[PDB]
Amino acid sequence: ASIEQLLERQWSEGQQFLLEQGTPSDILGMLKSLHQLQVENRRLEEQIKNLTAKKERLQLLNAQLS
Amino acid sequence: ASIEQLLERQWSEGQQFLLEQGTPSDILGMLKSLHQLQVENRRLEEQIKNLTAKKERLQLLNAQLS
């Protein structure tokens, strides 16, 4: 997610406002790329955190079994 | 034979090698997100550069018509 949906709704609303106002297409295209960049960065940060959690858990489990 | 095609070919080849070797799916997924992050960054840098070129050109044209 509802966070991802919140971020998407906020972004879409602002982009719709800009498009409605007739903002040059190149500026809108550029803003679409920054949004995609931010969306990719957020997913990558989460993917890394989940991989570190898995690393951290295995170390903890190993330590309890050894 | 582009420089963007070289970056894509290198990436795809390495990803395919990692998949062939049975690298955990989460690591593969993570690397796909970093690549998409890198491709978005490259398209965005170019979009910004083209917007600055347009700004710079209009200023120079205006100065000549001043």
How many Å apart are CA A45 and CA B18, to the nearest integer? 21
B39 closest CA partner among A36, A12, A4: A36
How many Å apart are CA A17 and CA A15, to the nearest integer? 5
How many Å apart are CA B6 and CA B1, to the nearest integer? 8
CA atoms within 13 A on the CB side of B4: 8
Q: Is B32 exposed, middle or buried (0-12, 13-18, 19+ CB in 10 A)?
A: middle
Query: Who's near A65: CB < 8 A, 6+ residues apart?
Result: none
Query: Which CA distances in Å does A7 have to A30, A35, B45, B47?
Result: 18, 10, 23, 23
B48, A30: Cβ pair inside 8 Å? yes
Of A33, A40, A47, Cβ closest to residue B29? A47
Resolution in Å, one decimal, please: 2.5
How many Å apart are CA A36 and CA A33, to the nearest integer? 5
| Residue A10: φ, ψ to 5° | -60, -45
Cβ contacts (< 8 Å) between A37 and chain B: which residues? 37, 40-41, 44
